[PDB]
Amino acid sequence: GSSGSSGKPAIPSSSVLPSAPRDVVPVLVSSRFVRLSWRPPAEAKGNIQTFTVFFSREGDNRERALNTTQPGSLQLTVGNLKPEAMYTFRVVAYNEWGPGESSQPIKVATQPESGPSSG
């Protein structure tokens, strides 16, 4: 796994930035959506607005971005996915400063939904 080669000038050395979240694990995965649960960062260094969760289909390079969590919850359910397909979910903390350390990219295979398989 190697992808990124990106960066901006005058950027903070992940000092006053929030530490990467706990290895996000697929507590609950569905055929259409996939829920994820992770622990909040102890050192936010300011005030966190929300958590950004990415998701992309196998092969493809780009990915969407869904940021929306409850007031006091680090759980976010991502829907509108494709069944019988490997997806790569991620998690990032966006605080006053900005996006701190990026979490580890996980791979979850959606559950089989009315698969075309001939028996």
From Swiss-Prot:
Post-translational changes noted in the entry: Ubiquitinated; mediated by SIAH1 or SIAH2 and leading to its subsequent proteasomal degradation.
Domain of life (superkingdom): Eukaryota
The Fibronectin type-III domain, residue ranges: 20-113
Residue positions with a glycan: N67
Tissue expression from the record: Found in axons of the central and peripheral nervous system and in differentiated cell types of the intestine. Not expressed in colorectal tumor cells that lost their capacity to differentiate into mucus producing cells.
Subcellular location: Membrane
Disease per UniProt entry: Mirror movements 1: A disorder characterized by contralateral involuntary movements that mirror voluntary ones. While mirror movements are occasionally found in young children, persistence beyond the age of 10 is abnormal. Mirror movements occur more commonly in the upper extremities. Some MRMV1 patients have agenesis of the corpus callosum. Gaze palsy, familial horizontal, with progressive scoliosis, 2, with impaired intellectual development: An autosomal recessive neurologic disorder characterized by global developmental delay, delayed walking, intellectual disability, horizontal gaze palsy, and childhood-onset progressive scoliosis.
Oligomeric form and interacting partners: Interacts with the cytoplasmic part of UNC5A, UNC5B, UNC5C and probably UNC5D. Interacts with DSCAM. Interacts with PTK2/FAK1 and MAPK1. Interacts with NTN1. Interacts with MYO10. Interacts with CBLN4; this interaction can be competed by NTN1. Interacts with SIAH1 and SIAH2.
Extra remark beyond the main annotation: Inactivation of DCC due to allelic deletion and/or point mutations is related to lymphatic and hematogenous metastatic tumor dissemination.
Record's function text: Receptor for netrin required for axon guidance. Mediates axon attraction of neuronal growth cones in the developing nervous system upon ligand binding. Its association with UNC5 proteins may trigger signaling for axon repulsion. It also acts as a dependence receptor required for apoptosis induction when not associated with netrin ligand. Implicated as a tumor suppressor gene.
Family: Belongs to the immunoglobulin superfamily. DCC family.
Descriptive protein name: Netrin receptor DCC
Organism: Homo sapiens
